[PDB]
Write a protein that binds this ligand. Sequence first.
Ligand SMILES: Nc1ncnc2c1ncn2[C@@H]1O[C@H](COP(=O)(O)OP(=O)(O)NP(=O)(O)O)[C@@H](O)[C@H]1O
Lengths: 51, 51, 51
Amino acid sequence: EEIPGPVAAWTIPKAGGNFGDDKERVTGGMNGVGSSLTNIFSVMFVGETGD
Amino acid sequence: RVKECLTIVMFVRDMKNMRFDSQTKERLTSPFGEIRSHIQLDAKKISRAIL
Amino acid sequence: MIKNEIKILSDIEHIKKRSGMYIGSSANEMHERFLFGKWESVQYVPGLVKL
Ligand SMILES: Nc1ncnc2c1ncn2[C@@H]1O[C@H](COP(=O)(O)OP(=O)(O)NP(=O)(O)O)[C@@H](O)[C@H]1O
């Protein structure tokens, strides 16, 4: 299925741009599951990303 | 008994190849060679400055 | 220039390349531990004992 960017980042786990090489990445993220973990335990949620 | 009487405020910026052992992410399991190669902090300055 | 290439690994290569995540400390280190009644300082490799 074709799912766009922010909704796959916020609803489906194992999704992120932090799955790169360990020798270059300065960010602390390694899971891809985080905003899904935020969104699952929320009864209301709205999220806007302008690019 | 030496190290039991200190409070330490350590903030480290711009590190690479971080490894934490849990999704809790509360503690670093990175190898000490990468951390020792990245850190160029003069700890002997801290030792003479608290001596 | 640093090299940013996103790599996805299978689980055998994920364990074999990121060995500190799953078997703990993978270096020859020293610990003060209980052995047969005595708290003594001894040096070993924790991965074999973990497995
Ligand atoms: N609001 C957001 N802003 C930026 N990136 C986001 C956002 N929500 C989700 N993402 C992306 O999706 C991922 C969120 O899941 P998460 O589990 O945080 O992954 P991680 O950052 O790789 N691991 P970790 O931070 O250790 O939990 C991030 O890696 C981002 O790439």
